[PDB]
Design a protein around this ligand. Structure first.
Ligand SMILES: N[C@@H](CCC(=O)N[C@@H](CS)C(=O)NCC(=O)O)C(=O)O
Ligand SMILES: N[C@@H](CCC(=O)N[C@@H](CS)C(=O)NCC(=O)O)C(=O)O
Lengths: 220, 221
């Protein structure tokens, strides 16, 4: 019995939706209205004291942080270790990419802007935040050099994690696929998964539209 | 020997790896990478780590980077038991949440946000936002320690090494009020009892604090 707490525009929530779909697991999806600060309710804080989404409930146990969740799901429920290989050297690449996503991409790239634009209602965003997004594209383009997937030669949860956030960066800076052909090819490859549209595609488009509506701009 | 660690003592994620190597009693070569001299940007270093960060670990022709990936690798490959990184999916999920909390909320948003501005871009005035972020980190860690002696449960794990390397470093920006944060104070004190703590984490924390003291940076009101 799985319950996922979150909302479709959220990148880390979509990373979990991709993993759940890839593992063909059934779950209840509970909406959490972040703009209304519904995550700050006493009832949600009891589930996740960091008051973030996603939170996964698995038969009474609460797990949070999307990367911890999707590793947990694969380790516990997958038929094989395909999505999260147990071989320590292969796992070390996956883990590096996941922690890259946690810090460099999401915390420094996305939440840094979401906080000032959506949470604080500010229209102007410091130029450093633009520079941070270009740095992310540059790194991811390098990470994809000579391989079809982000962490090696097979689909893993690192792909789910990073595609959920890297595709979201379009909300701030459109991806130039002439400058970034590897990133373009990799998103296109992942878009072919039958569950991609419902798990990640539509939420990306929603987030992009949310930020379009704010009319935010980068400071020079 | 077979293991090489690339890094430098003031760096919190390098110290996370030094703590783990010490706890596992592994021998290794320590190679200094002077990030102040931008030595991590040499083409030679980029071949080992294209993200040009420290730490990097070299193990028999393989390069691993990101401190959290490195220390999970070390325990899984070399430890006698999974004590420091339990394999039980549920216990593992708590450790993993704490590690990723360190990557994003603590290091990226808390420390590197200020370090880049102050150490490498020479800014002396830091926005109040960055002070508030450190206080929120202290608030979260205090909550995480509720009812237990360690950060991810009832036993020492790599989550303790990761988070103490960075949380102890926060003194460089905001001194820790142990009357407001008695659990954090006790937890740091408990880890300081580890005989390998002084060399692995303690010296470098003090170095980092002294580096920031010298810059004379302040937070805006
Ligand atoms: N790295 C974390 C990010 C979690 C996170 O910050 N989620 C955002 C939504 S995208 C959130 O919960 N914001 C509300 C809050 O922190 O109060 C993860 O992968 O779960
Ligand atoms: N979260 C990463 C942080 C790595 C990191 O950013 N290290 C800093 C030093 S504390 C660095 O290498 N700065 C040089 C650079 O990024 O070029 C980890 O745990 O390894």
């Amino acid at each position: 019995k799985l319950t996922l707490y979150g909302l479709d525009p959220s990148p880390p929530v979509r990373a979990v939706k991709l993993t759940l779909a890839a593992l063909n697991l059934t779950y209840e999806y509970v909406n959490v209205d972040i703009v209304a600060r519904a995550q700050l309710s006493p009832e949600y804080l009891e589930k996740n004291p960091q008051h973030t989404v996603p939170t996964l409930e698995d038969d009474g146990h609460y797990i949070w942080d999307s990367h911890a969740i999707i590793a947990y799901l694969v380790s516990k429920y997958a038929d094989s270790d395909a999505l999260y290989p147990k071989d320590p050297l292969k796992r070390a690449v996956v883990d590096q990419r996941l922690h890259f996503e946690s810090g460099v991409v999401f915390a420094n790239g996305i939440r840094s802007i979401s906080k000032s634009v959506l949470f604080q209602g500010q229209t102007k965003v410091p130029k450093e935040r633009y520079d941070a997004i270009i740095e992310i594209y540059d790194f991811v383009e390098t990470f994809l050099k000579g391989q079809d997937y982000i962490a090696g030669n097979q689909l893993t949860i690192a792909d789910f994690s990073l595609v959920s956030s890297v595709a979201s960066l379009e909300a701030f800076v459109a991806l130039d696929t002439t400058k970034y052909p590897r990133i373009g090819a990799w998103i296109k490859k992942l878009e072919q998964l039958p569950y991609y549209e419902e798990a990640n595609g539509k939420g990306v488009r929603q987030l992009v539209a949310i930020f379009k509506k704010t009319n935010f701009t980068f400071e020079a």
